Design a protein around this ligand. Structure first.
Ligand code: HEM
Ligand code: HEM
Ligand code: HEM
Lengths: 241, 70, 49, 75, 377, 58
């Protein structure tokens, strides 16, 4: 039905002009991605070395890559083989073609997570709102199990589930991971998978504001200086008597 | 799950959900909710009332939330 | 009669360093060109960046 | 085309100028300046402003009716 | 000496150095260089983009991501292109407007070439947006291109001719790429001719009076003021691309193309929204595209409906109000154009469309006549 | 300060277009070093993802 609700405005650490992006959070959010989110969501536009300078250290990132496997190049016959992932291959399609998603997932197709924060309005807020907030299907509404109920999601008939159910945890520094903290982190990491350039963008922006803020007055004084012969200028008309 | 992770959302939501604007909204929810139940061949489905409540609740949630989160 | 040809007062526009009919202008010239040029030099350094 | 010296015919008009290195680029900037911007605004509001508010109003009204329409009580 | 005589320098000298210009032009005359600037900025970031982009359906979108993540500084280059397109449109809209307000259109050739320049960049930009092969790229490519099917007895064949297939498929992307590359160079030659006809009279000015009596050389004066002018263009552009890269594109066009989906959305980029509104205001296939076209080619009718004895609007109050109602009406049009065709929006979108045409075709010329009469002219 | 800084800037460094060009280019170097770092530094009032701060922990 064409009747719905729009997400509120959460105070992320990466909204409001010159603003980093919580990197310790991107990392916890990566954890959330690899453990709970990746099972049914592809992020095929992000590789392991992207996680380098950012959250993890070089060795750390390779170790994660190493872990599981992919279908590497042709064995000298004509069949491919398996090996421990390198730092250069992108995260890991759980479903081959599109219809495999339909098969293993009620008949629905779970959309890619490479962008998503830029592919849905409100961005991280919508994902945050889609995550944490889940509700009891009101009166006269007929779910049908495949579709769950979800405020925010258009139509209210979803197909996902709330895979945030307070846990299926992880941890480095051991953050008390409830559904809240586990959600914020995914979105924060999601921001980064959508817009990696985020930090630097805003850094150049700081420099751009400081420079423009210094060039603008100077170019103006250059201009009024030359125009001053004209702005200050006097006319007189002296016709023959 | 059964008892022992202090979901901050739930905590802040309580205080939030409570509040005036949402009290009134939930009142209408219940009002309309009880109508829908009180019949058979009806269709005024109570979907709108829920969102209004949620909206009012959720704005106040955003404002008070993340403060605590680590 | 072209001798009636005034030259409107510009005190209302002249920099301070040049406000006195009583004294030279060769002195404040360096400071004046200095300022105006420093402005354009600083600008090019800026744009250069 | 057009050049300088072939533009038009002008007679008896004197023009005094002063070198840019002898005057200020920002004379009464705030003093004379601001009153001028106020005067220019006065002169133009009644011709610029109204059309816009007509839209401003059409805009907020237009949205309210839309949003309020996707709701309903009986029938 | 050297500047004046040398075959190449003459050109430069006659266009940017000794060109007699009115000592009178205001900020609204800066959009001329600004478009010039936008044109180059859009060719320069455009070329660097073509060094990594591939025009094939299966890699199209992927290559654009490749640019933003892997290509060094690919992201700025990408967003500068994206935002420069809108910046090019704001400037284009200021420029046309400026001329309308000031009677600059009395220079038919210059103006008419200007209309050809308006169309050329519109056709250019429309093809640009399809290249990433996003949801909106495909459906906007579909919705808009399909209009030509309203042309009687020729239309079906036409749409199928430019499409390359029976849809917006493989042939269409590569096709649209080629034209998106070739178009801005043609635009350039045309801007030279734009400037060629303009130089034949020199610029107009806010009074619409005539400035032979007070011209100043284009050099210190307008080179330095265009510089300061380009600087502000950069600010607007950079403020847009660094702080809000997806603001005017709206968070949407990500997620690849899907010829079976059809998003409950469908609207061209903001610069076509006024035209878009006019089109859907009319219940009729033919009429819609007829009025769609007319909403822009009408610029070629403006000089025939001048009517006033004065050239500019500076001394004409009633005309000013009517002009402002035109701009105000054009906001409504884009605003409506950016909304679904439901209850309130249809009827005002309908009314505003009639007004657009009533204003330019009837109200404005009448005000001119009235104005003449009040002055006893 | 005294017979003017600008006066000396003009007399010793701005009267020729050579020295003028020369100072601008020398002034371009340092400015870059000072600002590029200055702006990177000011940016450090966000002791957050600060790669340096994380470098110590892991
Ligand atoms: C691993 C278990 C998961 C499964 C089986 C799953 C499945 C799905 C499905 C079927 C949909 C489509 C809903 C519909 O079309 O009605 C969906 C959408 C979505 N998924 Fe999941 N999902 C999972 C986990 C996640 C997680 C953990 C996240 C992010 C934290 C996520 C992010 C999203 C988002 C943001 C949408 C919204 C699509 C839209 O708004 O149109 N998914 N998922
Ligand atoms: C001949 C010079 C040009 C070249 C070589 C060029 C190249 C490209 C390429 C390779 C793309 C696809 C990559 C991308 O989407 O970022 C693109 C997209 C686009 N072009 Fe151009 N372009 C040129 C001129 C122009 C002109 C003059 C305009 C009009 C303002 C324009 C408007 C656009 C737009 C709106 C997009 C899509 C926006 C985006 O997704 O970033 N281009 N162009
Ligand atoms: C590629 C896009 C365009 C470029 C590069 C361009 C360039 C220019 C330039 C450089 C000027 C110098 C005067 C000034 O600074 O305003 C000018 C003036 C003018 N342009 Fe354009 N223009 C473009 C599009 C247009 C279009 C869309 C129109 C209107 C249909 C137009 C019509 C005119 C007219 C009538 C003048 C005379 C203005 C006056 O003397 O007051 N141009 N144009």
């Amino acid at each position: 039905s064409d009747l719905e609700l729009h997400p509120p405005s959460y105070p992320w650490s990466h909204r409001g002009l010159l603003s980093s992006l919580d990197h310790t959070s991107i990392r916890r959010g990566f954890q959330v991605y690899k453990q709970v989110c990746s099972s049914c969501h592809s992020m095929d536009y992000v590789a392991y070395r992207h996680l380098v300078g950012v959250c993890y250290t070089e060795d750390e990132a390779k170790a994660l890559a190493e872990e599981v496997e992919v279908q590497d190049g042709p064995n000298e016959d004509g069949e491919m083989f398996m090996r421990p992932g390198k730092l250069s291959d992108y995260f890991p399609k759980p479903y081959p073609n599109p219809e495999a998603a339909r098969a293993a997932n009620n008949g629905a197709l779970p959309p890619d997570l490479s962008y998503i924060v830029r592919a849905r309005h409100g961005g991280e807020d919508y994902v945050f709102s889609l995550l944490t907030g889940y509700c009891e299907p009101p009166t006269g509404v007929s779910l049908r199990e495949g579709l769950y109920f979800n405020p925010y999601f258009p139509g209210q008939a979803i197909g996902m589930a709330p895979p945030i159910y307070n846990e299926v945890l992880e941890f480095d520094d051991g953050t008390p991971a409830t559904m809240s903290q586990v959600a914020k982190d995914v979105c924060t990491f999601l921001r980064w998978a959508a817009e990696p350039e985020h930090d630097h963008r805003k850094r150049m922006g700081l420099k751009m504001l400081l420079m423009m803020g210094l060039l603008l007055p100077l170019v103006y004084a250059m201009k009024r200086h030359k125009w001053s012969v004209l702005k200050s200028r006097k006319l007189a008309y002296r016709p023959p008597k | 799950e059964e008892e022992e992770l202090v979901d901050p959302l739930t905590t802040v939501r309580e205080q939030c959900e409570q509040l005036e604007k949402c009290v009134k909204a939930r009142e209408r929810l219940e009002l309309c909710d009880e109508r829908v139940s009180s019949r058979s061949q009806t269709e005024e489905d109570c979907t709108e009332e829920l969102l209004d409540f949620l909206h009012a609740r959720d704005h106040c949630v955003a404002h008070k939330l993340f403060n605590s989160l680590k | 009669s072209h001798t009636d040809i005034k030259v409107p007062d510009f005190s209302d526009y002249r920099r301070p360093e040049v406000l006195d009919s009583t004294k030279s202008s060769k002195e404040s010239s360096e400071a004046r060109k200095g300022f105006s040029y420093l402005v354009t030099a600083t600008t090019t350094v800026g744009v250069a960046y | 085309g057009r050049q300088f010296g072939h533009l038009t015919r002008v007679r008896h008009v004197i023009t005094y100028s002063l070198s840019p290195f002898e005057q200020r680029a920002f004379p009464h900037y705030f003093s004379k300046g601001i009153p001028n911007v106020l005067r220019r605004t006065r002169a133009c509001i009644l011709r610029v402003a109204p059309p816009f508010v007509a839209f401003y109003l059409v805009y907020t009204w237009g949205t309210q009716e839309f949003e309020k329409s996707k709701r309903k009580n009986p029938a | 000496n050297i500047r004046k005589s040398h075959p190449l320098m003459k050109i430069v000298n006659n266009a940017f150095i000794d060109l007699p210009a009115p000592s009178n032009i205001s900020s609204w005359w800066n959009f001329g260089s600004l478009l010039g600037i936008c044109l180059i900025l859009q060719i320069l970031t455009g070329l660097f983009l073509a060094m990594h982009y591939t025009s094939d359906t299966t890699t199209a979108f992927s290559s654009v991501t490749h640019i933003c993540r892997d290509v060094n500084y690919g992201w700025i280059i990408r967003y500068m292109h994206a935002n420069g397109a809108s910046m090019f449109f704001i400037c284009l809209y200021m420029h046309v407007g400026r001329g309308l307000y000031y009677g600059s259109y009395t220079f038919l050739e210059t103006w008419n070439i200007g209309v050809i320049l308006l169309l050329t960049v519109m056709a250019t930009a429309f093809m640009g947006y399809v290249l990433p092969w996003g949801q909106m790229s495909f459906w906007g490519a579909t919705v808009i291109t399909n209009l030509l099917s309203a042309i009687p007895y020729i239309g079906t064949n036409l749409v199928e001719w430019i499409w390359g297939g029976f849809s917006v498929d493989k042939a269409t992307l590569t096709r649209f790429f080629a034209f998106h590359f070739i178009l801005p160079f043609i635009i350039m030659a045309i801007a030279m001719v734009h400037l060629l006809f303009l130089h034949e009279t020199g610029s107009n000015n806010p009074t619409g009076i005539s400035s032979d009596v007070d011209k100043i050389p284009f050099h210190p004066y307008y080179t330095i003021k265009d510089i300061l002018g380009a600087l502000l263009l950069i600010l607007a552009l950079m403020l847009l691309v660094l702080f809000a890269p997806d603001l005017l594109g709206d968070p949407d066009n990500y997620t690849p193309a899907n010829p079976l989906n059809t998003p409950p959305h469908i609207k061209p980029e903001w610069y076509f929204l006024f035209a878009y509104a006019i089109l859907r205001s009319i219940p009729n296939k033919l009429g819609g595209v007829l009025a769609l076209a007319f909403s822009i080619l009408i610029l070629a009718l403006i000089p025939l409906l001048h009517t006033s004895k004065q050239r500019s609007m500076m001394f004409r109050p009633l005309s000013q109000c009517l002009f402002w109602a035109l701009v105000a009406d054009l906001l409504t049009l884009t605003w409506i154009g950016g909304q679904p065709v439901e209850h309130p929006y249809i009827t005002i979108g309908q009314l505003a469309s009639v007004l657009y045409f009533l204003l330019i075709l009837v109200l404005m010329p009448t005000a001119g006549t009235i104005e003449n009469k009040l002055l006893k002219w | 300060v005294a017979p003017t800084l600008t006066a000396r800037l003009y007399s010793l460094l701005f009267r020729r277009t050579s020295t003028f060009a020369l100072t601008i280019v020398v002034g371009a170097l340092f400015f870059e070093r000072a600002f590029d770092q200055g702006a990177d530094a000011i940016y450090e009032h966000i002791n957050e993802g600060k790669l340096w701060k994380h470098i110590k922990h892991k």
